[PDB]
Amino acid sequence: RIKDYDANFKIKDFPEKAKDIFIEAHLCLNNSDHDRLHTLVTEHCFPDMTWDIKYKTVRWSFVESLEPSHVVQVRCSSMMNQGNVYGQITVRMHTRQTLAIYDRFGRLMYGQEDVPKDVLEYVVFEKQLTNPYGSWRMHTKIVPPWAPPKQPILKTVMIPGPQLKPEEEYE
Amino acid sequence: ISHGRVFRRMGLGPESRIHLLRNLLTGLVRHERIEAPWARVDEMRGYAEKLIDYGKLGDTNERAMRMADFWLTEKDLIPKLFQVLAPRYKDQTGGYTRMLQIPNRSLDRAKMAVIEYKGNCLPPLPLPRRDSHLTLLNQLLQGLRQDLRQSQ
Amino acid sequence: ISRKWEKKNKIVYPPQLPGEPRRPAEIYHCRRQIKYSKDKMWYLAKLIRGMSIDQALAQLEFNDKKGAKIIKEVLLEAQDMAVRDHNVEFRSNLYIAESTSGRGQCLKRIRYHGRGRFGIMEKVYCHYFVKLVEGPPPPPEPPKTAVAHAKEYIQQLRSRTIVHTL
Amino acid sequence: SPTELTEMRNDLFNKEKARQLSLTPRTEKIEVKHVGKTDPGTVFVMNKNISTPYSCAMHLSEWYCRKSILALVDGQPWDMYKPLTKSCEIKFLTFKDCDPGEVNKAYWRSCAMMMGCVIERAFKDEYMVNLVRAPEVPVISGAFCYDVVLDSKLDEWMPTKENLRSFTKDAHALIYKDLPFETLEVEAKVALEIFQHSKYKVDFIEEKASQNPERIVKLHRIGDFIDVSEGPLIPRTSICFQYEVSAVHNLQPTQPSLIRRFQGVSLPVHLRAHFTIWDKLLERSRKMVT
Amino acid sequence: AAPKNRRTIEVNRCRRRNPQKLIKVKNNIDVCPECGHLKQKHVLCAYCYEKVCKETAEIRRQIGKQEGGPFKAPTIETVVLYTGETPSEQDQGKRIIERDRKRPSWFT
Ligand SMILES: [Mg+2]
Ligand SMILES: [Mg+2]
Ligand SMILES: [Mg+2]
Ligand SMILES: [Zn+2]
């Protein structure tokens, strides 16, 4: 149901395209180029990418991949909307990356400078099958329930307890 | 010039002065605890204490009845004065009312006092409490007291 | 109208080298169009001008003036956003860097005097501005000592030149 | 020679502190719940071996830091500036608390420590000053005390009133500096490397190592001066506001070695006395205490 | 009378900004040991007082329900009771007021 629309799609060569698209998206975040990112990432994804990143500096890099990227599942929509056919394909990627996020004052607030740590990620890609100018773009990430927690942050926090009105008691 | 002037001028004259104070007193009798401007609470406070002494005289006292009649506007409080308040304060010779300073009024920014008759039914006011005897200074003072008593 | 103060929170500095003092955090915040006199607001601004956040909140709590509760709100809002968005570790370690009141936009009404005479009454509005700096507040400059007076006097005599010669 | 000895002990203290810091893998987030009467159910997500009760206090308000003198960690007294270990329930203790029993004990223990500190550096090098310990004394007793062995040269020597005023101003200087009471909990061995010169400290360390199932002992440092303590101390020196070294008393059965019990009384800043009342408290501290 | 000349900014700034006309720092603030809010010494804690007055407000509401109309203030003493408590032997012979909640910790 992909082929009948494009007729020039190969499942063999796609993972590499998925890989390099992933990398250049993250490079976009680094240098804060939103226009290239738009050509590259869906409208669902972009808010999740960039809501926190504004007014802080990101230093993301790609170190060599461990396990080669491979497709896990491909699914297609079945005309839920007029003149709209979408195609979601899922890729497993297992690689080591480096990341640092700085504060607005440029104070390192998360990650490390230049030492890699391994990451296993599941990424979903969408295309407009109907549209001739449609393009494969990163759409979302799937987080597994069994995934280890993200590495701890630098600062300490306080969670406030219930702010009680005079006519209340703590339980 | 006004040395040793005891009463503070209050209403729109001496008649009004009494009338405001009488209203305050009537409230306090009924409810047993009342918030009002600090000056007026202080002013009325004295007449409140003097009322209990007249109440202590009893129903039989004709003088005391006439006084209670004037100072209580509700006329249903007069039985309460004589059969509730007077019996309550049988032991004490004085000190029936307590007055405290509470935060200033929002609208007006006036000094505000709560006045209450002691041993009422109501929830107790948060009262200033002196520090525990186990505090470092109190323990050192208790030390000195020990010295003096044990010396003889 | 100008709204420069708001934009001051959008300044991004480039990341520091490890061989650098830790830059204090920096929060600018304001309230516009407060129905209160700008000069009346000044006294309250001036009062809290160099104190820590909590100490300023304490002073503002028991202050009877109208604008005192307004400033309290602004300070609490500023403190909240400092922790949340400006990556400040502790909410307690902030002090008022600058506390300013400006004239806001005003309206004109009429006041009716005797005979036919009148006057132009102004509904006064004002802005309040604050800035918070992360870290302990600056210790106040010590009062000038006798030795300091003396020291500088000696300096002053030694600065004399024979005037209007070679 | 003592001037080199003091700095040597510092270097040794520092290197052990650095060692204990280094064995911590980055940062682990521990959770600490406020079990206080005020502001309940607050949870602080702190660093494992870094964050202190002071750090929790300064999440809350300056009112905590200003008026917090000790901590309860799982209901045990805990220094304000001591780094934590594990997730627990935390509450803070002040001087004007209902039962300030633990707080008073900690206060006196700390004042005695700084008295010993000032005594050591009060005499010239030709004489020998030997600090032995500070015994545990109830606050209801006259005053705090530190026991000292002086040189055989100063056997006849008794301090004058002017000498006492001298110590007074000297201890006052220490307060003015406002020095935090750094703490370090170690195994017995490394502490013995710290104190091997004075035997009077050696045996005391051995006592603490024996009584505890583990060989853990507490060493409290005030800027430069290291001393062995029996429990937790006050955060900073500024806490004290009045401080006079009252008297020195000779103990009776001291034919083999003379013991001089230095006594002085102190009050913290929060609980300050009027001029007259403090004076009568000094009078009592002049009496020999047992 | 009328001003003969305009007062300058400097003259005015000296008037306005002297310590006399400035707001003075209050030094009598403390922490309420009970609730942990800020109270002035010599004054009742604003929080704690509100708490009392909300309780006493509701008690007065129950008093109105039972009394039921003006000029009906009783000639006995009064006692307030909560859920799961009983009047004593000395409590017998005085006015009872019931509640639908537990007794407060601070009210004993
Ligand atoms: Mg009048
Ligand atoms: Mg007309
Ligand atoms: Mg005008
Ligand atoms: Zn309170």
UniProtKB/TrEMBL annotation, chain C:
Top-level taxon = Eukaryota
Q: Does the keyword Mitochondrion apply?
A: yes
Where located?
A: Mitochondrion
Query: What are the recorded GO MF terms, alphabetically?
Result: structural constituent of ribosome
Q: Which UniProt keywords apply?
A: Mitochondrion, Ribonucleoprotein, Ribosomal protein, Transit peptide
The record's Gene Ontology cellular component field reads: large ribosomal subunit; mitochondrion
User: Which GO BP annotation is one of this protein's?
Assistant: translation
Q: Does the keyword Iron-sulfur apply?
A: no
Family assignment?
A: Belongs to the universal ribosomal protein uL22 family.
The name on file for this protein is: Large ribosomal subunit protein uL22m
Q: Which organism is it from?
A: Homo sapiens
Gene name as annotated: MRPL22
